[PDB]
Amino acid sequence: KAAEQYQGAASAVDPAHVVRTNGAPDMSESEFNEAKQIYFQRCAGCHGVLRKGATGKPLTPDITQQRGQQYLEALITYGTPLGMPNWGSSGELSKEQITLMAKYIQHTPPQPPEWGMPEMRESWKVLVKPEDRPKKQLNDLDLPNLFSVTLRDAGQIALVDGDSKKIVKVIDTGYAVHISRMSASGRYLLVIGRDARIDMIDLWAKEPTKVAEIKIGIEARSVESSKFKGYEDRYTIAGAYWPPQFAIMDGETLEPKQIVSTRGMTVDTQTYHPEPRVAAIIASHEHPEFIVNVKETGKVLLVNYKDIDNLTVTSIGAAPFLHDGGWDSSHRYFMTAANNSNKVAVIDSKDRRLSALVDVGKTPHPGRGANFVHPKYGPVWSTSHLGDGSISLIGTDPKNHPQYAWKKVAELQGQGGGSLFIKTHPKSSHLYVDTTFNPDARISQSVAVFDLKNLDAKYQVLPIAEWADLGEGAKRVVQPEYNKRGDEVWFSVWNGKNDSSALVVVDDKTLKLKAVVKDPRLITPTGKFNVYNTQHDVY
Amino acid sequence: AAEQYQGAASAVDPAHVVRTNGAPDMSESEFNEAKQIYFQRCAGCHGVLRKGATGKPLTPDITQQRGQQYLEALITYGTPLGMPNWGSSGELSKEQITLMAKYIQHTPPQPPEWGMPEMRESWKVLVKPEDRPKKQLNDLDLPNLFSVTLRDAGQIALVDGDSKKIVKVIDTGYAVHISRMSASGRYLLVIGRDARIDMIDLWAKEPTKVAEIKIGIEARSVESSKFKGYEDRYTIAGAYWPPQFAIMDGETLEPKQIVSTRGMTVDTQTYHPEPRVAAIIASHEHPEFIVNVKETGKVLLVNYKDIDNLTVTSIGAAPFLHDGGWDSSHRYFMTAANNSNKVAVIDSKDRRLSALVDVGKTPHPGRGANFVHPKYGPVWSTSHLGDGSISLIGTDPKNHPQYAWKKVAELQGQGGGSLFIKTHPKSSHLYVDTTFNPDARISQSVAVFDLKNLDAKYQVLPIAEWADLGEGAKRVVQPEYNKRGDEVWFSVWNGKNDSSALVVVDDKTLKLKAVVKDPRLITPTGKFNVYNTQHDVY
Ligand code: DHE
Ligand code: DHE
Ligand code: HEC
Ligand code: HEC
């Protein structure tokens, strides 16, 4: 009873300032659930689970009820020229459905489940123990030249032989794998689906097989392996969209070790954000750390794995909406993009600080970027954009080129906006740029190629989807990817689930069609990752 | 283009995202009546989001599972495991208990957040550092000044140690919880449970407030940088709500950084939406702050060498971290995980957890009592709320590795409800209060042990009786020494409409020495001697 009186006083919190949420328009279970289904299929990706993910005002009840039924139905119907699509004018949703959505966003956001250690371990499986695994490569495949390709809708991935252009093995994975990464030893291929399910693949088995699996959240996009000297296959890290967290696992078995929440204060307004999605993750070569990108709060975390029992995290503030990115030629500066902020953040991994914030085009989307030596400006890193057809070239040499370091030194012009990936290779004199989400079909089905030896000349357009000879379908071309020796660049002809797709290979030296990969199993091919280039960050 | 890029379906399954309800309808006045009772009477233990107490949380999934009558029966008779009986005792009516049962079946109302805009709005520089004196402009013996908390008055009082007279009363935040000193010994920092901080300059003609700021809706702790070369550099405060801490300029109180403590627990490793910040202590080994996060049981080492890019080492300990203090050497932070009945040892030099020592029912050491035991070498002690024991823990890894991090011995006091144990380098006595003991006589007195003869039973000093105050609970709390170490002060924490006092004792003879009374001395709780607080002398 002593301890009961000890903690018996009043909370300093004023009841009058703790508010009950409601005053929303009534809707039955049938109605409520219909809107909710529409919400996650059509709105969630941009607005988030708790409705604070997009730019502009959040869709939380304090704002929506203020605007009211009429204003909301009107906005959802026509959209806005700032990124909010029109759902009525386009015919996407009915007026009845839009009325449902306007009612829906006036209610408190339904809560998705959390996903801690018990859920994680439950989902964790070791298909093949480290003791039962081969001591050496048991197949005669040229693993470095293998291409891990995502059969998106199929929920699988395909290993494709670089030289033979044939599918060696198809593997079952999590739905719509987003990226593929290689372990520092070059033996394990890691893949993670948007459903947060990670699969570990042993390339040394007679036939490449899965040795371990785990689910690290409800939704996810990234995975990475420890690449610091003396830590080959030590730790594997993965970031989730929901819950706002990342998890560190055992490199050999994928055993859950640490789970860290990214919920926190933003870099810009320094206010609490309840859902800071984890974006890109890259492993440091300077220190035993993982460089994690936290989107909404716009934070770059340096997570030290030298001692995972007592995690040390350095939080570097950058700019809101961090997404993708990659290393500079030297592998010390993490050139990442804050897309909605129209900036590229530069993270000095050695000194562990924000080297600079570079102003670029509308909605930069570099992927891992493209590094090359410019005749006049020296070592540069480049990116294309979704908001425009420009290509930003940034100087990346502080030591021997202070005049150009962290400056948008020059621009190039491609086919137009809607670009996703820019590419090049050390042995190549060409720079590729795609246009996957360009509203023009011809431009979306082709790629622009620049001449590094003559950057003044306009690009050449390579008709990739046409070369494929596929037939009907949108046939969107996406992500150029070189092979081991960088003498051929690969592309994905991302056609529908019920249509026909292909991977088109081009001779880098002649810019001529070299081959086309077709297979009934090659369903919705998207990302392609060449083992050697992925593992050694060659781009 | 960007609209098609981010146009695919989210990987989250709509069928697993749940709408809350199925709660008993209650009008606006009924919900508000319940909500008021909940923060006046329940929140302290259960918390804002109802996940702060042991046992099952009071969230809709559980409360609706138990049902209306189960809840009414539980709130009415309580449980032997820490849940008070509100009906049986007669505290709440059956009509109110019915409202409470219905209330916790609804989603928890949400309190506002509190970020940088709110912080800067509340931030006030009263006297600019340039406009402040360059020397001490008064004749006060600052090191022997006591900062006393006049709880219900929302003020503190500076009492001259030798004269026993109130030197100045200052308006502060409501119910200040602790007083802390800047490393230079010039500024006094106080923080109210309402999260309002006040910085006081002791060098001014009359010690006065130079700055103030509010770092949350509810808080308890504050601290200053004590690493060499960092005097008055930064000030840190921990909040209960929102679940966070903030770092500010140690000269102006300007908010610089705010860090959320919401996260994963150390035991179950699941997400906890409300991990309150408990004690905070400044490191002498590195340029860091050692922060306790209660519910997740984490001790964070927040480095301030580069305040722009904050680096935090997260150390797991045990759930329900609360109060704690240094060992005689000032390298090991001895902190109590009260509900876990353990004392965590954080090595601030090597930056790791040295041990988890099993102690008694609900440890509550305050900052603890350090003293060299004649047999077991240097130890750090603590008393409890749950029982009448006093744990003695060895703290000497070098010269006494056999006793290091072991509950080496045990002393017995008057009983439970204890809150503070105390001693001093120059003293040979060990004091222990028993503030929340259900017996009036025990709670109005303190026990004293002879450190030169620990086998001998304690003496009982009738502190409240010595005060001669008349009616009231007259609960005595927290022993405190003067700089010389020859006087020990106690607070007679009576009601606000009653008479209170500060009883001072001759440590050398254990005889009454002085009694401080004043119409202004309302509900005197914590007392912090300037020097002893600044140099962590305990
Ligand atoms: C955070 C993130 C990364 C960086 C990973 C890293 O390196 O750690 C990334 C990379 C990638 C990469 C990496 C390529 C590389 O060369 O590194 C690929 C292939 C890719 C295929 C697609 N991405 Fe990606 N992508 C998102 C997020 C991300 N994508 C989205 O949230 C978004 C905007 C919406 C969505 O529906 O997921 C999105 C849409 C797409 C697509 O439309 C693609 C083409 C097909 C798909 O599966 O949705 N994203
Ligand atoms: C986190 C915390 C600390 C350590 C801070 C530090 O050292 O940096 C502390 C210390 C303290 C100290 C520090 C003394 C010391 O020697 O360091 C004092 C005097 C004190 C007076 C009280 N505390 Fe305290 N206390 C709480 C929290 C805390 N108290 C509570 O939440 C609790 C259990 C419930 C409440 O009502 O707030 C509580 C009740 C009390 C009381 O009942 C006291 C006697 C009067 C009051 O104002 O509530 N607390
Ligand atoms: C990204 C590709 C989006 C998708 C898909 C949807 N919305 Fe959106 N929405 C988006 C942006 C960037 C903005 C900002 C608009 C601006 O000009 O500032 C919005 C805004 C809204 C709003 C208005 C909020 C307000 O200002 O009060 C609403 C009500 C809204 N969006 C609704 C909504 C719904 C119901 C959607 C799916 C059916 C949806 N959005 C999808 C970006 C995107
Ligand atoms: C601490 C001093 C408390 C105060 C004040 C109140 N409660 Fe409590 N409560 C407390 C504990 C430690 C526990 C666990 C007890 C156990 O034996 O497990 C509880 C539990 C409850 C419950 C039952 C929860 C369940 O198991 O379903 C209820 C319904 C409950 N407490 C309600 C509640 C209310 C409404 C209170 C204020 C009027 C309240 N508690 C105060 C600790 C504390």
GROMACS .gro file of C-alpha atoms in nm, chain A residues 2-13 15-20 27-29 32 36-37 40-41 44-46 49 80 83-85 107 110-114 116-118 152 194-195 218-219 245 257-261 263-265 269-272 309-317 323 352-353 365 386 418 420 437, chain B residues 1 3-12 14-19 26-28 31 35-36 39-41 43-45 48 79 82-84 106 109-113 115-117 151 193-194 217-218 244 256-260 262-264 268-271 308-316 322 351-352 364 385 417 419 436:
model
  156
    2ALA     CA    1   0.303   0.226   0.048
    3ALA     CA    2   0.397   0.207  -0.318
    4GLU     CA    3   0.031   0.269  -0.407
    5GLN     CA    4   0.036   0.604  -0.222
    6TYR     CA    5   0.379   0.681  -0.360
    7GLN     CA    6   0.237   0.675  -0.716
    8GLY     CA    7  -0.104   0.809  -0.608
    9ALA     CA    8  -0.078   1.178  -0.701
   10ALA     CA    9  -0.241   1.341  -1.005
   11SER     CA   10  -0.086   1.340  -1.351
   12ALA     CA   11   0.050   1.680  -1.449
   13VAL     CA   12  -0.147   1.634  -1.772
   15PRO     CA   13  -0.769   1.629  -1.866
   16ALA     CA   14  -0.919   1.926  -2.054
   17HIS     CA   15  -0.637   1.909  -2.307
   18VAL     CA   16  -0.668   1.537  -2.374
   19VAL     CA   17  -0.915   1.514  -2.659
   20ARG     CA   18  -1.169   1.249  -2.763
   27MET     CA   19  -2.083   0.477  -4.181
   28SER     CA   20  -2.164   0.107  -4.124
   29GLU     CA   21  -1.912  -0.176  -4.119
   32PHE     CA   22  -1.622   0.162  -4.361
   36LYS     CA   23  -1.056   0.112  -4.614
   37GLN     CA   24  -0.994  -0.139  -4.894
   40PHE     CA   25  -0.470   0.086  -4.904
   41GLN     CA   26  -0.497  -0.012  -5.273
   44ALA     CA   27  -0.169   0.444  -4.874
   45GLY     CA   28   0.145   0.435  -5.084
   46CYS     CA   29   0.158   0.819  -5.093
   49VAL     CA   30  -0.084   0.411  -4.305
   80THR     CA   31  -0.440   1.903  -5.753
   83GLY     CA   32   0.089   1.559  -5.699
   84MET     CA   33  -0.269   1.471  -5.595
   85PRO     CA   34  -0.430   1.265  -5.877
  107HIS     CA   35  -1.253   0.894  -3.896
  110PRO     CA   36  -0.752   0.218  -3.831
  111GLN     CA   37  -0.447   0.068  -3.663
  112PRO     CA   38  -0.229  -0.196  -3.830
  113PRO     CA   39  -0.058  -0.454  -3.609
  114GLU     CA   40   0.292  -0.405  -3.465
  116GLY     CA   41   0.814  -0.722  -3.269
  117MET     CA   42   1.061  -0.994  -3.177
  118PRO     CA   43   0.798  -1.267  -3.102
  152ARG     CA   44   0.735  -0.921  -5.958
  194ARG     CA   45   0.750  -0.559  -5.033
  195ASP     CA   46   0.572  -0.782  -4.775
  218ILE     CA   47   0.428  -0.573  -4.254
  219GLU     CA   48   0.570  -0.374  -4.546
  245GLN     CA   49   1.166   0.023  -3.792
  257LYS     CA   50   1.905  -0.972  -3.305
  258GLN     CA   51   1.794  -0.611  -3.266
  259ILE     CA   52   1.487  -0.415  -3.374
  260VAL     CA   53   1.500  -0.034  -3.365
  261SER     CA   54   1.214   0.214  -3.394
  263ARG     CA   55   0.950   0.691  -3.500
  264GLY     CA   56   1.086   1.033  -3.406
  265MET     CA   57   1.138   1.405  -3.454
  269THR     CA   58   1.021   2.138  -3.826
  270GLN     CA   59   1.151   1.919  -3.542
  271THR     CA   60   0.804   1.782  -3.462
  272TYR     CA   61   0.703   1.424  -3.391
  309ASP     CA   62   2.431  -0.584  -2.777
  310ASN     CA   63   2.468  -0.213  -2.701
  311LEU     CA   64   2.375  -0.041  -3.023
  312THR     CA   65   2.541   0.293  -3.098
  313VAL     CA   66   2.355   0.506  -3.352
  314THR     CA   67   2.466   0.840  -3.494
  315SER     CA   68   2.176   1.042  -3.622
  316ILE     CA   69   2.265   1.281  -3.905
  317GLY     CA   70   1.998   1.524  -4.018
  323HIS     CA   71   1.466   0.774  -5.063
  352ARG     CA   72   3.036   1.087  -4.032
  353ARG     CA   73   2.872   1.417  -4.124
  365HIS     CA   74   1.552   0.958  -5.862
  386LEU     CA   75   1.076   1.196  -6.227
  418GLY     CA   76   0.936   1.002  -6.564
  420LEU     CA   77   1.393   0.604  -6.292
  437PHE     CA   78   0.682   0.652  -6.607
  540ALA     CA   79   0.469   1.036  -6.369
  542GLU     CA   80   0.166   0.978  -5.948
  543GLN     CA   81   0.219   0.649  -6.138
  544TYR     CA   82   0.548   0.582  -5.965
  545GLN     CA   83   0.387   0.582  -5.620
  546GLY     CA   84   0.057   0.442  -5.753
  547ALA     CA   85   0.081   0.071  -5.659
  548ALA     CA   86  -0.110  -0.094  -5.374
  549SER     CA   87   0.042  -0.087  -5.029
  550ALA     CA   88   0.169  -0.422  -4.905
  551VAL     CA   89  -0.048  -0.388  -4.597
  553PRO     CA   90  -0.676  -0.398  -4.541
  554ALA     CA   91  -0.836  -0.691  -4.356
  555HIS     CA   92  -0.573  -0.672  -4.085
  556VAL     CA   93  -0.615  -0.300  -4.019
  557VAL     CA   94  -0.871  -0.272  -3.740
  558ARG     CA   95  -1.141  -0.016  -3.657
  565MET     CA   96  -2.143   0.748  -2.291
  566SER     CA   97  -2.240   1.115  -2.338
  567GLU     CA   98  -1.993   1.405  -2.344
  570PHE     CA   99  -1.684   1.070  -2.083
  574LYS     CA  100  -1.149   1.124  -1.811
  575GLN     CA  101  -1.099   1.369  -1.523
  578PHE     CA  102  -0.575   1.153  -1.479
  579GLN     CA  103  -0.641   1.265  -1.118
  580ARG     CA  104  -0.642   0.907  -0.988
  582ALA     CA  105  -0.271   0.785  -1.499
  583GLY     CA  106   0.015   0.810  -1.258
  584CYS     CA  107   0.049   0.426  -1.260
  587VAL     CA  108  -0.158   0.828  -2.070
  618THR     CA  109  -0.583  -0.654  -0.625
  621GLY     CA  110  -0.047  -0.304  -0.659
  622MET     CA  111  -0.398  -0.209  -0.776
  623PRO     CA  112  -0.577  -0.004  -0.503
  645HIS     CA  113  -1.296   0.337  -2.530
  648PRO     CA  114  -0.802   1.021  -2.566
  649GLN     CA  115  -0.487   1.182  -2.700
  650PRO     CA  116  -0.285   1.455  -2.524
  651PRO     CA  117  -0.109   1.705  -2.751
  652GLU     CA  118   0.248   1.660  -2.869
  654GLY     CA  119   0.784   1.996  -3.025
  655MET     CA  120   1.032   2.268  -3.117
  656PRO     CA  121   0.763   2.526  -3.208
  690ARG     CA  122   0.546   2.176  -0.367
  732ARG     CA  123   0.621   1.822  -1.286
  733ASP     CA  124   0.449   2.047  -1.545
  756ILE     CA  125   0.340   1.842  -2.065
  757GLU     CA  126   0.476   1.637  -1.774
  783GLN     CA  127   1.113   1.239  -2.483
  795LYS     CA  128   1.864   2.262  -2.963
  796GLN     CA  129   1.767   1.894  -2.990
  797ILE     CA  130   1.462   1.681  -2.909
  798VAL     CA  131   1.485   1.298  -2.907
  799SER     CA  132   1.199   1.051  -2.882
  801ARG     CA  133   0.935   0.567  -2.798
  802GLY     CA  134   1.077   0.226  -2.886
  803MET     CA  135   1.140  -0.142  -2.823
  807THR     CA  136   0.995  -0.874  -2.469
  808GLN     CA  137   1.158  -0.653  -2.737
  809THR     CA  138   0.822  -0.522  -2.851
  810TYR     CA  139   0.704  -0.169  -2.924
  847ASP     CA  140   2.438   1.866  -3.439
  848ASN     CA  141   2.480   1.497  -3.517
  849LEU     CA  142   2.378   1.331  -3.196
  850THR     CA  143   2.526   0.993  -3.108
  851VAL     CA  144   2.339   0.767  -2.865
  852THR     CA  145   2.451   0.429  -2.723
  853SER     CA  146   2.153   0.230  -2.610
  854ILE     CA  147   2.213  -0.004  -2.317
  855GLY     CA  148   1.954  -0.257  -2.207
  861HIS     CA  149   1.367   0.499  -1.202
  890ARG     CA  150   3.001   0.226  -2.149
  891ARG     CA  151   2.833  -0.111  -2.076
  903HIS     CA  152   1.398   0.328  -0.410
  924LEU     CA  153   0.918   0.088  -0.060
  956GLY     CA  154   0.745   0.284   0.247
  958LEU     CA  155   1.218   0.659   0.002
  975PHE     CA  156   0.483   0.622   0.288
   0.00000   0.00000   0.00000
